[model samples]
Target chain A: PHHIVIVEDEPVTQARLQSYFTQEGYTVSVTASGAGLREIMQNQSVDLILLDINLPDENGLMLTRALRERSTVGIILVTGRSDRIDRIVGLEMGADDYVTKPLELRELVVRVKNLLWRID
Target chain B: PHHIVIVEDEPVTQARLQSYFTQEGYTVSVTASGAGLREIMQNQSVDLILLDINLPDENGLMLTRALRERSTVGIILVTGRSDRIDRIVGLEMGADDYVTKPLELRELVVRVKNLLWRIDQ
Candidate 1:
């Protein structure tokens, strides 16, 4: 069983992601800040991180860069609409993949599966 | 220099892709059908393929499967809007990536370069 952490700020978005991944049989953790994400990383083995790019406490791109430097744990940045530059920047920063909101949950799950397959 | 084939039917789309990739220093080939693509593959060393998923004579998904069976050349499927299932099927069919139309040229280029990098590695 793979563990996935959803790093999102909004209560609704966090709940949605946590519910979806949890239903999909992943051990899902939810957090709203970069510091929370880092704490999760420090505390447990996470198979992947579904990181929201804009958080209240820290820019998701910075977290992506920092986490990528230390771990090969798959990182998928959840972005806003039409953030073309952010998508490219995130990829260059070593994020494995990204999905834009309004997210199609099924498509997102496919991407998650694809990245995990590659990483494995 | 990377050689890329644009397997697209629409003249306007083909011309746009051909012009963009040519200016980007790639050897570009244009073909509007699966047979034409096969002919080119038989004749040249193609580094990547920019394949349109909907073609007049052959389905892009079928092409993807057949191509994947024969070669390790990088493939990026050019798709239409809301073709989520096709996108998933294309990836499962061995495509390296996909870009939805109206294509963002720069983003498409980034995806192309990214796949090429992975294939090379």
Candidate 2:
């Protein structure tokens, strides 16, 4: 099974994404901020990451650029309505794809599966 | 200039798409049905096609399948809410990408440009 970590500050959004992926048979983990991200990455072979653009303490695009310098794990941006420009910026920052909020879970799932398929 | 053909039945939607692409400097053509598609293909070097999934006289997926059998022109599905399954089916049928209605003109433009870049590479 593929492993996914969701870096989101909103608890409800984080929980729902975790629940959906868990139901889909993925080993899922949720982080309230980007602080514990490296810890999780070092501890497990993460296959993908769902990154929220607006976090309490970090910028998702910055995180994406840093991660791409060292890792090939798939990154998908979880963006808000005003984050449209950032979504395109994230793709250029090395994100595999993105989904705008309010999220379309099925579309995100399809994109995740498609991204993993390409990586494999 | 790159040429784009819009295969849509709705007049307003077709006109807007035609206008947007024309403004973007691409040669744009409109068809009320898929009937004269081959004639356009034969008459011009189309760089891409904006295909409406629910045409009055043809199934977009069938048209996609037929087109892919002979050409590599980029295909993007313009879909209605009910055409979700058909959107995925169209991708499998060889469409390069898709955008749901009411059409996001900017998003369609970006998808078209991205598709063309990949084709050239």
Candidate 3:
């Protein structure tokens, strides 16, 4: 089972993902803000990070770049809008993959699985 | 949210689907055999059923066809093997949808939502 951390501001979506993935036999954790993720990571060993770009405190793309510089942990960007896809195009945002919402849960899981398989 | 009953024999998979969909905010309950499903339905009001086709007690197709005649509830068949998918093609099993294992949870959820949406109409 993989350990996943979802950094999303919306509590309802966060709860849904956490519970749904947990049933997939994975250990899941969540944070409502980008800053809080660092605190959670200090003690937890996470395999994947689901970073949302519309975070209240910080831009997720910068966080992804910083995280990529430090560690090889998998990063999956969750942008809330369609146009932001262009923001990362041809740029080294250090994201292994990206998913836009309203999200399709199966699509998200498949991307995560594919990236993790490569990482494995 | 809809109430779902999973008539799956495998404990681990049953637990996973139950927890996953429950988090998606549905009321979920599980039974290990097709024989036990009748008992669950008697006590709990269920909107959908996930019937695993190869049960140890009874074949799920017979059980599903029986379920359709008695109620207008949604039935989604789960077949662990590819061969059984062909068996489901022409039967008036009255199944709203069917998904094969290793089951994709999102696909199952999508089917459930679509069926429930249509049932609402």
Candidate 4:
């Protein structure tokens, strides 16, 4: 079972993800801000990161750029922006995959699985 | 002026890209083999590479992977395959952008310019 980290500020969305991934038999952790997420990464061996770009305290793209400079951990950007330009920019910044929001929970779960599988 | 390199084995495609980018005021170079293309990069300060994946001698994706290991030159993969898997694989290998073939020359030029602009910033 892989450890997946969800970095989203929305409480309801966070709860939903935690419940869903836990039910799927994987250990999951959720963080609401970039700083808090960094703290968790410092302590844990995370296998994948499901990052939301519109974090309240920091831009996830910038955060991802910083993370890429340090490691090649699997990263998937979950965002509300549907622009092709945003997708291109996110990939350019070292994100492994992108899923736009109003996202289906099942679809998101499948993407998480697929990304982790690819990395493994 | 940005120097763009086109690596395509087809004569018509090479001519088309050369004419199109030349008209847009960019200095462009064309090569038919990976070896020839590597030679051009040795002598010129190429700003961008428009690489064809189905080369006559070597896989362009393999060449792009080799290039990424050596330089930060902007790369855009042009392939005849329309599979989404191909695209994701290309991006994972460090290509800046990808355009599937049966390509429109105008759209290709715009993508090339946009890629160069982003790198410049």
**Cα lDDT of model 3 by residue, A37-57, tens digit:** 887787888888888777776
Model 3 stretches astray by more than 4 angstroms: A1-120, B84-86, B89-91
**TM-score (2 decimals) of chain A in model 3:** 0.89
The DockQ value obtained for model 1 is 0.28
Residue by residue across A18-42, what tens digits does model 4's lDDT show? 8988999888989998887788889
Per-prediction TM-score to the true structure, in the order listed: 0.76, 0.61, 0.48, 0.53
Model 2 per-residue lDDT at A75: 82
Per-residue alpha-carbon lDDT of candidate 2 for residues B56-89, written as tens digits (9 for 90 to 100): 6788888997887787788887777656678567
Fraction of true interface contacts that also occur in model 1: 0.14
lDDT (Cα, tens digit) per residue for candidate 3, span B55-96: 888888888778877777877778877763433441345565
Top-DockQ candidate index: 1
For model 4, state the Cα shift of residue B68 in Å: 0.6
Candidates ranked, most accurate by TM-score first: 1, 2, 4, 3
What shift in Å separates residue B63 of candidate 3 from its native position after superposition? 0.6
Q: What is the Å distance of residue A106 in model 1 from its true position?
A: 0.6
Q: Write the per-residue lDDT of candidate 1 for residues B48-106, one digit (tens) a residue.
A: 99999988878998899898887788888897765767888887787767788788787
Best model number under TM-score:
1
Give the better candidate number (1 or 4) by DockQ: 1
Write one digit per residue (lDDT tens) for candidate 1, span A1-118.
8889999999998898899988888899998988888898899999889999988657788889998788888888999997878998888776777889897787788778756655
Clashes (N, CA, C under 3 Å) per candidate: 0, 0, 0, 0
Tell me the TM-score of model 1. 0.76
- For residue B42, model 4's alpha carbon misses the true position, in angstroms, by 1.2
